[PDB]
C-alpha cells in the first residue's frame, strides 16, 4: 500500500462526515458511545463504513473520526508551534 499522511486522512475524514447526512434523531436516553472503535485504523474505519450496512456501527465510525479529528487538530496546533 502507498504512504499515508495525517493531513490526508484528516481531510478524507472531515469531508467524509460533511458528505454524510445529518437528519439523525435516534437520541434516546442518551447512549451511542457503546461502540469503541478508537483502536480501529483509519483504513479499517473508512473501509467498514465503505462496505457496511449497520446504522449504529456506521455512526460509531463517523463519531470516531470527528473525535480524533478535533483532537488531531488540537494536539497538532499545540505541537506545531515551538
Curated annotation (Swiss-Prot):
Subunit architecture: Homodimer; dimerization seems to implicate the unfolding of the three-helix bundle region creating an additional calmodulin binding site, and cargo binding. Able to function as a monomer under specific conditions in vitro. Forms a complex with CFTR and DAB2 in the apical membrane of epithelial cells. Component of the DISP/DOCK7-induced septin displacement complex, at least composed of DOCK7, LRCH3 and MYO6.
Tissues expressing the protein: Expressed in most tissues examined including heart, brain, placenta, pancreas, spleen, thymus, prostate, testis, ovary, small intestine and colon. Highest levels in brain, pancreas, testis and small intestine. Also expressed in fetal brain and cochlea. Isoform 1 and isoform 2, containing the small insert, and isoform 4, containing neither insert, are expressed in unpolarized epithelial cells.
Region annotation (Interaction with OPTN) ranges: 67-69
Disease (UniProt): Deafness, autosomal dominant, 22: A form of non-syndromic sensorineural hearing loss. Sensorineural deafness results from damage to the neural receptors of the inner ear, the nerve pathways to the brain, or the area of the brain that receives sound information. DFNA22 is progressive and postlingual, with onset during childhood. By the age of approximately 50 years, affected individuals invariably have profound sensorineural deafness.
Name of the featured protein: Unconventional myosin-VI
Biological function: Myosins are actin-based motor molecules with ATPase activity. Unconventional myosins serve in intracellular movements. Myosin 6 is a reverse-direction motor protein that moves towards the minus-end of actin filaments. Has slow rate of actin-activated ADP release due to weak ATP binding. Functions in a variety of intracellular processes such as vesicular membrane trafficking and cell migration. Required for the structural integrity of the Golgi apparatus via the p53-dependent pro-survival pathway.
Post-translational modification: Phosphorylation in the motor domain, induced by EGF, results in translocation of MYO6 from the cell surface to membrane ruffles and affects F-actin dynamics. Phosphorylated in vitro by p21-activated kinase (PAK).
Residues of the full protein shown: 1050 to 1131 of 1294
Coiled coil feature spans: none
Amino acid at each position: 500500500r502507498p504512504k499515508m499522511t495525517p493531513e490526508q486522512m484528516a481531510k478524507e475524514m472531515s469531508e467524509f462526515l460533511s458528505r454524510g447526512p445529518a437528519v439523525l434523531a435516534t437520541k434516546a436516553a442518551a447512549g451511542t458511545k457503546k461502540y469503541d472503535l478508537s483502536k480501529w485504523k483509519y483504513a479499517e474505519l473508512r473501509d467498514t463504513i465503505n462496505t457496511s450496512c449497520d446504522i449504529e456501527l456506521l455512526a460509531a465510525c463517523r463519531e470516531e473520526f470527528h473525535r480524533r479529528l478535533k483532537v488531531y487538530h488540537a494536539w497538532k496546533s499545540k505541537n506545531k508551534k515551538r
